Amino acid sequence: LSAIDMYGHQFCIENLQKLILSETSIFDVLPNFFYHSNQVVRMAALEVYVRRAYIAYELNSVQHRQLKD
Amino acid sequence: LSAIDMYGHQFCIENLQKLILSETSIFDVLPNFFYHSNQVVRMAALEVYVRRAYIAYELNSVQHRQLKD
């Protein structure tokens, strides 16, 4: 939480490479806040989770939507 | 700001009375932060500001809005 930018930018890709080059699996606690009241930990954690799935595939575009509310 | 609930509850009814029963004058410092980055406590703190302006007039409806982003 300290790491995360928490503007709309939310480019904490470097901390993410520590996450993706984590000896530890981060599906354990990461879920408790990625449905926290904080749009940033929601969004970030969620797409990296995608990435934690498709580490195998090639991702050519990923856009976040933010709907109805 | 710590006091402020920061959720949809947003019950700073009592805190508005501490603002209006403040040994400290609080039109001074409160304004510096109600344009901080955090939308719910924004909502709570800000509407208490509303309440501190028109406590004199009669308010029959107040909706928090949430724009562009």
UniProtKB/Swiss-Prot annotation, chains A, B:
It comes from Homo sapiens (Human). The biotin cofactor is covalently attached to the central biotinyl-binding domain and is required for the catalytic activity. Consists of an N-terminal biotin carboxylation/carboxylase (BC) domain that catalyzes the ATP-dependent transient carboxylation of the biotin covalently attached to the central biotinyl-binding/biotin carboxyl carrier (BCC) domain. The C-terminal carboxyl transferase (CT) domain catalyzes the transfer of the carboxyl group from carboxylated biotin to acetyl-CoA to produce malonyl-CoA. It is linked to Acetyl-CoA carboxylase-alpha deficiency: An autosomal recessive inborn error of de novo fatty acid synthesis associated with severe brain damage, persistent myopathy and poor growth. It is found in: Cytoplasm, Cytosol. This is Acetyl-CoA carboxylase 1. Monomer, homodimer, and homotetramer. Can form filamentous polymers. Interacts in its inactive phosphorylated form with the BRCT domains of BRCA1 which prevents ACACA dephosphorylation and inhibits lipid synthesis. Interacts with MID1IP1; interaction with MID1IP1 promotes oligomerization and increases its activity. The gene is ACACA. It comes from the Eukaryota. Cytosolic enzyme that catalyzes the carboxylation of acetyl-CoA to malonyl-CoA, the first and rate-limiting step of de novo fatty acid biosynthesis. This is a 2 steps reaction starting with the ATP-dependent carboxylation of the biotin carried by the biotin carboxyl carrier (BCC) domain followed by the transfer of the carboxyl group from carboxylated biotin to acetyl-CoA. The chain holds residues 1105 to 1173 of 2346 of the full protein. Expressed in brain, placenta, skeletal muscle, renal, pancreatic and adipose tissues; expressed at low level in pulmonary tissue; not detected in the liver.
